[PDB]
Amino acid sequence: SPAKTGQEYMERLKRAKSSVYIHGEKVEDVTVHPAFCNVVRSMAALYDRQYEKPEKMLYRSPTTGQLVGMTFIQPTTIDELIARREATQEWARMSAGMMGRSPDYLNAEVMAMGVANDLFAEDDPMFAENAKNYYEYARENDISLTHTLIHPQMNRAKALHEQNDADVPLHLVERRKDGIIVSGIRLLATQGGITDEILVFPSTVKKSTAGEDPYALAFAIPNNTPGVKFICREAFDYGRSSWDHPLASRFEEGDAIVSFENVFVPWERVFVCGNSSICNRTFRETNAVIHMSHQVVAKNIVKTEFLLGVTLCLIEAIGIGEFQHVKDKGAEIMLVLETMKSHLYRAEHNAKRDRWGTMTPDFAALDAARNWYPRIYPRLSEIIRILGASGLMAIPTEADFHNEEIGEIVSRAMQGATVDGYERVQLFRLAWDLTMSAFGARQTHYEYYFFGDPVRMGMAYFDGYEKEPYKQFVREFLRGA
Amino acid sequence: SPAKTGQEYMERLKRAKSSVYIHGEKVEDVTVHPAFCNVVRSMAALYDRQYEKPEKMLYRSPTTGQLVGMTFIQPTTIDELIARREATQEWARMSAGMMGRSPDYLNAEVMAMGVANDLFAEDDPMFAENAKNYYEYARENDISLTHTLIHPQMNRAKALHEQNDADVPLHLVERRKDGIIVSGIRLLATQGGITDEILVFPSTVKKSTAGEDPYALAFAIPNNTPGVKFICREAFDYGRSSWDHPLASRFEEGDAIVSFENVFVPWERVFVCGNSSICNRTFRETNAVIHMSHQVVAKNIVKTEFLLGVTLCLIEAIGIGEFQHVKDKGAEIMLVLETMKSHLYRAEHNAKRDRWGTMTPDFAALDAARNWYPRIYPRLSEIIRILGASGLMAIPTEADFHNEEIGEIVSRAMQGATVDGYERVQLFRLAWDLTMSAFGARQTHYEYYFFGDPVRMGMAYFDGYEKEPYKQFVREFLRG
């Protein structure tokens, strides 16, 4: 079976030896370096879950007949579509919705563009073939992927070609028989260099013009390709136990600058080569934004369930369940959860087959969800913070509980209404790690910016909305005077 | 009886002569008095639509075989449930979502109580039979209804029995062989005195204690019952044309104080008689809150499409649609629309049969919707006001355009980007009447307080929510 286990996943990262830098040093082994080993372990547990629950987490490849990841499926019926989502939710439950690049996110993108690959043939028929071959290769080899969609804009008032240093952003250096050469920088590769391969693709939102053709690239390459380096930001896993830092010590995915010094990309791994127009249409005409949104909305639901659980546990632990303002705050989170569930229900049950036979979720539902959820997420976090109150700062370590001189003092001190001190501090430390640690604050920031800047997403949502019917309804009504 | 036409509807009001008071005088005929005649004509037109499209607006009564209003249906399949909703939306589109008491709101309530009537039998088996017969009576005679759910709380820090005047709220005076006698006051009867009959029911939200048993009433009577008076608030229809006041001169429903002086109610029209515990459960255990929420969310969607339309039209007319803050304001309203359409989709397609055979909408979805939309409606209103800006105050009358001295001046002056002066003032008048007239401000207030105070609704929403799964998920996570 080509679908991989946790240890097969770790063994492939170890043998890859990608050029990865953190805290001023080259990383010898990502599987054991303190900044990465925990999140690698968490990913490994996802691959183990596929084998624990094969009937739900695997399916038969239409090309090879072997058991491959469910999250790669091309759904052709609403049942297959729901099945894909249930697999996404199983992993999302394991990571409390904290992972932005669990394999299922990229698996959806790669499938969509494999299957709906025709756009690419406008440039050359080979790029369309490459897309299909790439998806099959990814699925049949259980590749783990991230992407990078973000250029170093330096001056946002201006286009990439106008910057002081126009060569900083990733661009095409030349074309050859056997492939292409690229140089420059991409930003925010989440799980950069603890994945097998990386998709370099255009932005979801930021629409690029004719002068930016040298920057308009889509391709996928091994993380360890010669001349690629992953320069990680500072780790937010400070090496603590998962009682003390219950999230940061399990799900800290890293964000990385990606450098390309003179990187050779073989032709077979290229999808778009120096074409603003095709780039600008890639997410839309492959339907990839739809399947990517499906996964995200499903994951957001699991995550909202978790924040809700924390909120409710906090409420009970401190005995504040009877105040009106507390109940309304609880009601805010509950409404968000039901809203997201309602969009997902419509997305799946109102799905229709596209011209490639893919059962395609109703995007009117998912597009609203993905535009709304980021805007409201900071308030969900603000709610946990406000309810926890001064108790969020009363967070001694586990070690403080086991100390001979103070263990009892601390136990009695940190007592709640309905809980002993040890269980209460554990609970509050989870609320804290979710909202006020560097890991938690980053979760808020990441949800808000997940598919791009809400300011731009809002402009694009308005412009893409079918607005004529609503005018016609109002114009008829005025005519009847 | 044949389902009603518009003429039949107006004929019954005329013949009933309810005691109705407005602006300090008794009303002789509600069908011609200037405060009501326009809204009566809008109501009439809904009944006319029922006969123009019988396949969509009527169905065969399961008891008599006759065509009766679709919005009375007891849906037994998903398709019948969608069919009821489409009829509600036909009517809602004709009134741009403005009507709080189009018949379909109450028709849902009365169906739900008539079919799921067993609750009432806890006090006496006759009261459950009364609910069933009342449903059949309403459907087979195409009764138009409103209700009244709100007591005069005077001091809100206290229960009704503790007020300085304990007898002001409507309460039971005595019991008799043939019926009961009631006295006192109910508030906020929307369309009070332009309906055939009125439901007197408990609140949806506010819970009552043992000491408030004398106030715990559920019954239905004709509007013209002896001893019943409707004392109406000031009209927000100032008698202007429908170019000037395009909403207020068509859909001003009225809100009335209802007075009962020693009113006789026959036993056959009583559902709950002096029982807090039953009253507290009436909206939930009949499933009436669910079916009523179905109607409201469907109507809210039509309403939001209307607000969206107005907003977009303003944007085009003024030429502001390339500014990013304007686009984002447009986007706010669209997200609301898709949010409510998604809840409605889930409500209908995830519906299940209840013990009584009724295909019941998914209330997890409708409960969220009906709690959320009131909260967010003020913002939709605020968006129209902000976009319209100074242009909302440049609203000369139709007659100004007709005036020989100034007609041409005004036309040239009130020009827009993509519209003539006349068409532009008409559009801004619609935006104005929707948000800044007495009519429009009322629309915003009415949506906010529709099923009750959001403060109390939020508390009830929290307490009613199935919370255990979520806490268990986090506790499993903490365990390992």
Added chain:
Amino acid sequence: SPAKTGQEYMERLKRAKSSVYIHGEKVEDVTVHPAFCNVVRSMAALYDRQYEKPEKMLYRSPTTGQLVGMTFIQPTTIDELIARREATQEWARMSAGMMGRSPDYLNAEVMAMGVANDLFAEDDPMFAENAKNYYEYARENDISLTHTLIHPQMNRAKALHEQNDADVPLHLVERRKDGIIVSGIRLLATQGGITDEILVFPSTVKKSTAGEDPYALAFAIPNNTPGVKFICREAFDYGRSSWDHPLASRFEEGDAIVSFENVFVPWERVFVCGNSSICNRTFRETNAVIHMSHQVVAKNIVKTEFLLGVTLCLIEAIGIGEFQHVKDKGAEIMLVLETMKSHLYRAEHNAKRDRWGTMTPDFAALDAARNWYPRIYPRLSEIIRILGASGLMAIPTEADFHNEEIGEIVSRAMQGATVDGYERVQLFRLAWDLTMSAFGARQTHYEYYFFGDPVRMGMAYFDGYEKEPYKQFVREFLRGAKSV
């Protein structure tokens, strides 16, 4: 004595006979037409108050030495500046802060430009002289004024000269020996044609470009100037009693479209003639925006005192004063009140003399206040609406209480915790007329858009802020921790 009484004020409007149109008809006499008569009587009452409280509302003219209106003063001391504001607040209290064009608002504008008129000499020295002459004329004859700053922007995605009809907005037609000819349209003359004269002036925010020179006018004319018509939007005084409509039947100021068909403006009435650059700087370099803002903040404080009053009264009548959400809403309004008073306190007591010797309020305070208050005002309105709840829709009329069949029923029905039926409906009717009548909704819209669009006002506020100090502070702090 040249300061006017209420009757003198009314008799001037009657004898002036401006061309005023409302509800499809020419108005014969604004002082008795139903749409204007109440507000005219309210304005009359302000002029009467002058003479009832002369030691507070009048002062000796520096040029004639006779008693003139205090809100004309050019303050040269902090005392005289406070005195002006107390005068503003006397009138604001009589109107519950509801009037946008009480005479004091425009009186401050005309004073500031009369005194700091040197900008105008950039175009032509006579224009500076005119401004000074106009100020003295307005003060010495107690002229009541409004203004209009608003062009008919048809397509806001373009400039006035790029519109499909470029001749709709008010523009210069030609220049003659004795004056100028102007044609076109201006919007939003609040109190249009129930004042003696009108100021036609540039926007306080909207900047104009080279191509909009022909539209860049500043002048003052009598409201009855031949070729001038005031076309009023429909009145929001529907002729009710002040028990029923306590505000709309007293303070409905009107907003007029102003038409000019080949209107002649004498040169002595001109301040700016077809000059975008000078228009763009008119409010700033004259300090007019500062004195106008002083008047506005003082009036906004009065208005907030009233809203607070109404809110508290509602809370006690209904008996909800013990709910925490209710108390927090009360606290919001209180904080707004204290914020505005703080800004006024700093504005006055940190005033400094300008190069003309006018004691000039500290604009850092007033500018923040005038940017903030509009943005927060909708919420003050929302709070009254929310606390009032269902009771706001239970508004029978006075005539319902006086009807013999239903009077008693209504009285008993409408009781509150601490007030009887008649008192309760009267209070709720004031809350209603303040926030949910056409009058009330307009008040919310008027505050929000008072000095212009908050979107533009915020861009100007940011651009005009002295930002450099705060960058240097941060940059020094970073310089500490640098490596080499």
Added chain:
Amino acid sequence: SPAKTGQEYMERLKRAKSSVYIHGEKVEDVTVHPAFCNVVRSMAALYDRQYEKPEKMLYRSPTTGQLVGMTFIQPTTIDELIARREATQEWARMSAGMMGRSPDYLNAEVMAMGVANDLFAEDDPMFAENAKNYYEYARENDISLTHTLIHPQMNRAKALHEQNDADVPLHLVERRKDGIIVSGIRLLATQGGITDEILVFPSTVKKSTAGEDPYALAFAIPNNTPGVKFICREAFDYGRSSWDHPLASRFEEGDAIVSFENVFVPWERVFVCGNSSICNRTFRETNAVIHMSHQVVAKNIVKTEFLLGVTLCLIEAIGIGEFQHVKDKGAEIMLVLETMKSHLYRAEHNAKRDRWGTMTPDFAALDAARNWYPRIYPRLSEIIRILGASGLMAIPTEADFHNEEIGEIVSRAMQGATVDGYERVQLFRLAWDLTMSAFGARQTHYEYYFFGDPVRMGMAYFDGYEKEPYKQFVREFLRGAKSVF
């Protein structure tokens, strides 16, 4: 000269040897432990500033005639009140407004209660004398103080005496000839065990009823009193350079649980002994909330000036200054700064003497300021987060710049519009440490909760407001339209 230098301050802490625990172990020396050494140097530097700028930061003691700290002053004129505030702002500027328990906050409380001590005589006349004595002692020895006002609320829906464990909150155990015994816990000692003494006082907002008399204590004791332990929450200074963590590695003040095992307090250190009613009035009737509020608002202004500065630097660096949404977000911060400055101005210039002769700021201004700013602070933080966007996550370390293999790649990669890579990542790291580090989020959470829960503060503000005048105004207006039927 009794005012202390930085090294006198560090020496005094080192010799006191309080019982302080963090990360599961007893701290030997708070001057050198990695969790405190940075903040201790930051406090030391405030005490050195005192001596660098004596004319502004010191004054002549009214009792001894020697030079003592200005923030202790009992102001008798508007000038002395302004001078106190300028000293507060000198220290606030060194800390970018980030320190919640710089000595000046406490010094204002202790002065207020020393001078306006009459309330305490209601229980026992010695307690009023003690408060006066305590003020002079703290001033004359330049005592650095913090306080704890928070009880372990376990079940917040119930009073302290109805808790599952009524003995957990700090309470009177017995009274003696010579003093009192207290046992139990207090919850949020900021700078616990890096000060000389701690004030144990009632809440500013939370009322206590009878039944909570055993819990209504006011006293001051040395941090090293036998039976007292400070149990610190985990450090948010993770031992990085001040280029990487520019705020967390200078101003991490620490929050401490304060434990008392049958601790002896001598009578001379007691101000309130088991009296709810007097505790409930302690902050008002001494005017201490006024002078504390003065300090906080002045500090809040310095802090807003710094957030503004960060916001504007970010906008220039990234080149986003011409977008309207960005300019409005700038304007939000400017309005807050002007609002706070206006309140402060009114507070000082409209100050009036109290019955003890202290020039007392106008509390109408300061009470609004202190209720409002906590509510608006999270928005200021969200603006920095929003504007910084993806750049906030592009934060390589200083050591990444200094690596030979990647240093130049990172410099080119992280350029801004108007700044090079190194200067840019430094700026964004300040923005990050201000809003999105453990340090940053704490700042936002501390500002919000500073003088108590806004929900309770808002109730108290409404209840305390002089409401009748506004009702009379409205009623007179209504009276005008009354029919005589």
